[PDB]
């Protein structure tokens, strides 16, 4: 347990009377240790919430006190209480048995229908649904045609330039970021207006047609085999679904329309469908997790990256054992015969079920997520919110939601109007770095002031070569943070958990698989491969 009130006078400095905040925490803690008994695992959550409040209390009343030290260090054993909590109140509770896939805004891939089959096959004790929106099938093919335009426009305002003119280092994504604001910009006022009748669909083959040219007939037949592909594969539609609500339902279209940002609306999502439903929530990307320790006895070539070694296992069983009819041999390229061999008898002799692991019963506390956590560029894991396990009542998913609301309510309430004033992208930056100067709250750690610092470049993501924005704002670092907010008895911090910290609520590697074809395909998000506007100059 925690230690002793008597115990607890370590704190004690020699002829130092007592202050009352220092005796509020002593008759917390005598309670405490007595007072757990008749009692439920959010009580006891709350009651060392009041602990560590106490706690600041003091050390914020008595910033020089000679107790602090002492109560530091017994603050840490709330967080090993916090650890032991959560391991035992995984005892006898399991996760929903619901599995949720989500893939929104366009056409599915074929391989997507494959790794959803997959899922299928392997946990027929699951409830598995995949959601898309019927309503906004071409928000894909609006962001193209968004960047596909303006891109033609600025380059033929530039024609001869092309020489090391004036257009050098890319100037380009300036001058066509300002473009990209006005369409931006003109989306919305169309969307405002039309919103109460019509589906967002419906205003893009609008806004494509009146202001690109763009033939409506195409657009249709876009849509009808866009839906007919999601009928088919039995997908459930959201706008059907009371999934989407309140705040989280306003970002989700902002992410729709003001970005254009699908991984932003999938993110959102995400959060809804888990508060819904609960259970798992996993990317198209991952598949059913592998059981790569019966290939220990088969040593690694040399050369070989660890990821791509693990890809190639993977496509032994998936041929061998017929699981998929158009996963090619891409990673065991590199593998010499000798070794593939190996593998693909070592894979004929072993059963399916053997090689491949189902779901089953996951054990989770009421007070976690679990959380995939990948490896990152320097070697060290990260949170990703490719794989979530959450029942809907979860204290931790709360947190999720406030720090999506949080995040989202700071960045409108400073952007929002100032993209309904401001009718140039100049101008918008202007208008917007000067209000971030003015709201910043004074005292923010690392991490929120590096959030601040991100809100100027919110639009441009996915339209400037290097920006990703989102990371802050609906993805993995609201994760962490969130996390960070119940193993610290905290809300709406900016703040992340140590790499010690984070294991806490990491979902283990027996639940996905991540070392997938398109799961390395979707690794070229972040490249220095920018240089390559020349790709386009070529088109036109």
Same mark, same amino acid.
């Given at each position: ?5 008597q ?7 020699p002829?130092?009377?007592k202050?009352?905040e220092?005796?509020l ?5 005598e309670? &405490? ?10 009580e006891?959550?709350?009651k060392l919430?009041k602990?560590?409040?106490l706690?600041? +209390?003091?050390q914020?009343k008595?910033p ?9 260090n &017994?603050?840490?054993?709330?967080? /090993? ?16 048995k +619901?599995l ?10 074929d ?6 089959? !997959? ?5 027929k ?10 309503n ?9 045609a ?8 600025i380059?033929e ?10 257009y ?11 473009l ?6 003109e ?6 207006? !039309? ?8 205003? @893009?083959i ?5 202001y &690109?040219?763009?033939? @409506?007939?195409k657009?249709n ?15 459930t539609?959201? +706008?059907?679904?009371?999934?989407l *609500? ?10 729709l329309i ?27 990307? #991952? ?8 290939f220990?006895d088969? /040593? ?16 032994a069983?998936?041929?061998e054992?017929?699981? !998929?009819?158009?996963?090619?041999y ?11 061999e190996?593998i693909?008898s #070592? ?14 019963? @996951?054990?989770?506390?009421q ?9 990152a ?5 990260? #949170?990703?919110?490719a794989?979530?396990?959450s ?10 939601? /406030? ?5 989202? $309510? ?12 401001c ?8 208008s ?18 590096? #959030? ?13 070569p290097?920006?990703?924005? *989102? ?14 907010? *119940? ?5 709406? *911090?900016?703040?992340?958990?140590? /790499?010690?910290?984070?294991?806490? &609520? $990491?979902?283990s590697?027996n639940?996905?698989?991540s070392?997938?074809?398109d799961?390395?395909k ?11 506007? $020349?790709?386009q100059?070529?088109?036109?």
């Amino acid at each position: 347990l925690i230690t002793r009130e008597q115990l607890m006078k370590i704190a004690s400095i020699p002829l130092k009377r007592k202050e009352p905040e220092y005796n509020l925490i002593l008759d917390a803690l005598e309670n &405490f240790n007595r007072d757990i008994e008749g009692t439920s695992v959010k009580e006891i959550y709350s009651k060392l919430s009041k602990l560590n409040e106490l706690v600041d +209390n003091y050390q914020t009343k008595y910033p020089s006190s000679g107790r602090n030290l002492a109560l530091e260090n &017994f603050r840490d054993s709330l967080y /090993s209480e916090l650890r032991e909590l959560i391991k035992n109140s995984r005892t006898s509770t399991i996760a929903s048995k +619901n599995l949720s896939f989500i893939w929104i805004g366009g056409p599915i891939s074929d391989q997507s229908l494959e790794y959803y089959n !997959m899922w299928k096959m392997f946990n027929k004790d699951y409830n598995i649904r995949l959601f898309y929106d019927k309503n906004s099938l071409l928000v894909n093919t609006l962001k193209t045609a968004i960047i596909q335009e303006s891109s033609k426009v600025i380059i033929e305002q530039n024609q001869s330039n092309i020489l090391d003119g004036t257009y050098g280092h890319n100037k380009f994504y300036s001058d066509r970021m300002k473009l990209i604001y006005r369409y931006k910009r003109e989306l919305k006022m169309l969307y405002e207006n !039309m919103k109460q009748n019509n589906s967002v669909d419906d205003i @893009i083959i609008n806004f494509l047609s009146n202001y &690109f040219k763009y033939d @409506i007939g195409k657009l249709n037949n876009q849509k009808e085999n866009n839906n007919n592909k999601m009928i088919a594969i039995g997908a459930t539609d959201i +706008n059907t679904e009371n999934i989407l *609500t309140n705040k989280l339902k306003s970002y989700y279209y902002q992410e729709l329309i003001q970005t254009n940002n699908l991984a932003a609306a999938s993110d959102i999502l995400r959060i809804a469908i888990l508060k819904k439903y609960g259970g798992v929530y996993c990317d198209l990307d #991952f598949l059913p997790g592998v059981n790569l320790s019966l290939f220990n006895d088969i /040593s690694k070539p040399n050369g070989m990256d660890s990821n791509y070694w693990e890809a190639a296992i993977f496509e032994a069983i998936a041929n061998e054992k017929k699981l !998929m009819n158009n996963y090619p041999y891409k990673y065991m390229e590199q593998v010499p015969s000798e070794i593939k061999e190996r593998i693909l008898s #070592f894979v004929r002799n072993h059963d399916i079920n053997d090689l491949i692991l189902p779901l089953g019963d @996951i054990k989770i506390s009421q007070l976690e997520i679990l959380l995939s956590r990948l490896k990152a560029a320097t070697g060290k894991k990260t #949170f990703s919110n490719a794989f979530i396990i959450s029942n809907n009542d979860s204290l931790t998913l709360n947190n999720l939601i /406030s720090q999506l609301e949080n995040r989202y $309510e700071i960045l409108n309430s400073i952007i929002q109007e100032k993209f309904k004033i401001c009718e140039t992208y100049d101008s918008y930056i202007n208008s917007v770095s000067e209000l971030v100067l003015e709201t910043t709250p004074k005292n923010l750690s690392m991490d929120g002031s590096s #959030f601040y610092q991100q809100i100027i470049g919110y639009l441009s993501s996915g339209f400037k070569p290097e920006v990703n924005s *989102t990371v802050f704002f609906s993805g993995p670092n609201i994760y962490s943070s969130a996390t960070c907010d *119940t193993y610290h008895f905290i809300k709406n *911090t900016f703040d992340m958990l140590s /790499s010690q910290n984070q294991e806490i &609520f $990491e979902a283990s590697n027996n639940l996905y698989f991540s070392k997938t074809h398109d799961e390395f395909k979707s690794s070229w998000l972040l490249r220095s491969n920018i240089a390559e506007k $020349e790709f386009q100059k070529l088109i036109k």
